[PDB]
């Protein structure tokens, strides 16, 4: 019964930065992995970047050196750097939070999802 | 009579009863040694004038020991010569002529117990038996030295005495088809739940996970539990004896020990696999992989086979003593016998380990969950409430046992059988227990009701 409120979207040029933000709303426990997602016209849910609650994180190969994840101090926020922006970049992007309450799996958050335009 | 269903009122399953089969010398509440059903070797502190006296009975070097069939043979020739020893009194008779068939076996019972000069004393108790008093021999007899020595007993013989029915022992028959139903409910509940685990895994591709990989081998062994060794045990206990012979009696305790080393070394893996999902996931996504994983189930069953047919089948877990070699001569005995040597290392391999390593593992995840990037919310309270239930059940289930399985072993006849067996079940339902603890994920609830179209 948590909210992920996100944050950052919009259109933006070819090479142009760009800045996502997820607010986690609620309860969630110590142990987690909070990380963004996307969908690409015509392709399956890619995992584009997700940071562990400690501290480690964990990139996609076709946007490593590009994007960076991090994350607020108590707020459970979470800041999605995108730099040098490519027309393949275009997709929905989906907030993300990996929950490991009951220990033996992991309950999944997701958000409401933005649109990122990329112009060719 | 045309009697032939189960329970007929008589002297002989009385006293089984009332004193239990017992083939190695033994003492009573007293101090006397006792073998068999109740059979008084001798009054002497010496265990060797007992087994001089046994040897003497028997017909030969008994070293402590007889068969079931000796036993038997005892428990009778004593019946039969405390009735003998009822008609050639003076005092025994005329009351054992005036009492029914019931009342009878009582006064039987007590000769057997007590001789036939210790129930001749009972004057007055058997004046008031004579003229048909019951109750006031009932209150009189609760007077006496026996009715303190062995108030138990004595208070099942004085209410035959009393009612003049088996009221006080036909209630024992019921808790075994009472007790008997409970373990065709475990059965039928360990073979459910673990197939219906294996069915979700292996139909649904988006149950195809590491973690996942591993319930599939708990579920295994826990189906293998539930279908091997529980039914045959139940069947062993039941029946009182075993009918499938020596080679099966011990392929079945090979798959008993097989099973419950796997089901626990698994848990194990399974609290370590989490451990390193939880704390370092991006480690553990890239490091263990399927094949990796399915390499530690291979293990993990090497290692259960080892400490299970292995030195079974090659009779290394065998016991020395006299009962033990007995046992492993009579094709209708399938009696758990071994050294200390198998014990030790078995309980320490199949428990011991996993238990120390679950409980680091689990203790590090409560302690390192402490001091990650973070108000005493609701989601701790349940998460280590989860954790709670997961390592209670687990020792609530598998640790009295394997305290009793090492200390039985120790120290000789400390812990009664009934109790060891008990326990032992009391193991044997956690492979039921897990299905309901390690498949609670979203994932496994829509497998679950997808299987059988709820
Ligand atoms: C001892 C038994 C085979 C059940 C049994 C009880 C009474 C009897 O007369 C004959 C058989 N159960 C073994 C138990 O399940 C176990 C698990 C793991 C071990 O490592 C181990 O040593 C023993
Ligand atoms: C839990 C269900 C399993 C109960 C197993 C009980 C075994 C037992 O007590 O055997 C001795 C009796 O037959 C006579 O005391
Ligand atoms: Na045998």
């Known amino acids: 019964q948590v909210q992920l409120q996100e944050s950052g979207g919009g259109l933006v040029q070819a090479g142009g930065s760009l800045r996502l933000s997820c607010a986690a709303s609620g309860s969630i426990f110590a142990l987690n992995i909070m990380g963004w997602y996307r969908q690409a016209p015509g392709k399956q849910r890619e995992l584009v970047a997700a940071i562990h609650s400690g501290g480690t994180t964990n990139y996609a190969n076709s946007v490593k050196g590009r994007f960076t994840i991090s994350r607020d101090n108590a707020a459970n926020t979470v800041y999605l750097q995108m730099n040098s922006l490519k027309p393949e970049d275009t997709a929905v992007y989906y907030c993300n939070v990996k929950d490991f309450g009951a220990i033996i799996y992991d309950y999944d958050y997701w958000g409401q999802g933005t649109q990122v335009t990329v112009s060719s | ?97 005036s009492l029914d068939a019931v009342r009878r076996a009582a006064l039987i019972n007590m000769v057997f117990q007590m001789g036939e000069t210790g129930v001749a004393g009972f004057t007055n108790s058997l004046r008031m038996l004579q003229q048909k008093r019951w109750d006031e021999a009932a209150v009189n007899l609760a007077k006496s030295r026996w009715y303190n020595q062995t108030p138990n007993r004595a208070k099942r013989v004085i209410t035959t005495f009393r009612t003049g029915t088996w009221d006080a022992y036909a209630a024992d028959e019921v808790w075994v088809v009472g007790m008997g139903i409970v373990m065709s409910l475990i059965v039928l509940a360990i073979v459910f739940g673990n197939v219906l685990v294996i069915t979700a895994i292996a139909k649904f591709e988006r149950l195809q996970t590491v973690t996942n990989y591993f319930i599939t081998s708990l579920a295994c062994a826990d189906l293998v539990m539930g279908l091997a060794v529980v039914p045959f045990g139940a069947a062993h206990i039941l029946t009182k004896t075993w009918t499938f012979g020596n080679f099966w009696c011990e392929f079945w305790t090979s798959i008993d020990v097989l099973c419950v080393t796997a089901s626990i070394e698994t848990l194990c893996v399974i609290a370590v696999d989490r451990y390193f999902a939880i704390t370092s996931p991006f480690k553990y996504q890239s490091l263990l992989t399927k094949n990796k994983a399915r390499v530690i189930i291979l293990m993990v069953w090497i290692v259960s086979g080892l400490t299970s047919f292995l030195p079974i089948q090659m009779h290394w877990y065998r016991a020395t003593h006299q009962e033990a070699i007995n046992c492993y001569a009579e094709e209708t005995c399938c009696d758990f016998f071994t050294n200390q040597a198998y014990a030790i290392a078995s309980s320490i391999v199949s428990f011991y380990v996993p238990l120390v390593i679950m409980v680091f593992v689990y203790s590090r995840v409560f302690q390192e969950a402490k001091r990650q990037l973070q108000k005493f919310a609701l989601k701790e309270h349940k998460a280590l409430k989860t954790l709670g239930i997961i390592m209670g059940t687990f020792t609530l289930c598998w640790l009295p046992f394997f305290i009793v399985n090492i200390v039985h072993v120790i120290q000789d006849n400390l812990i009664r059988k009934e109790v060891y067996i008990l326990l032992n079940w009391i193991g044997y339902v956690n492979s039921g227990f897990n299905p309901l603890i390690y498949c609670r994920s979203p994932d496994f609830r829509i497998a679950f009701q997808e299987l059988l179209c709820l």
Do not use: C
Request: aromatic residues 8%; negative net charge.
């Open chain 2, 1 to 97: 009579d045309a009697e032939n269903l189960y329970f007929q009122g008589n002297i002989f399953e009385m006293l089984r009863i009332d004193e239990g089969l017992r083939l190695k010398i033994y003492k009573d509440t007293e101090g006397y040694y006792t073998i068999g059903i109740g059979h008084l070797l001798t009054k002497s502190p010496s265990l060797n004038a007992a087994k001089s006296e046994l040897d003497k009975a028997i017909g030969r070097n008994t070293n402590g020991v007889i068969t079931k069939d000796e036993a038997e043979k005892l428990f009778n020739q004593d019946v039969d010569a405390a009735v003998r020893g009822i008609l050639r009194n003076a005092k025994l008779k005329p009351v054992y002529d």
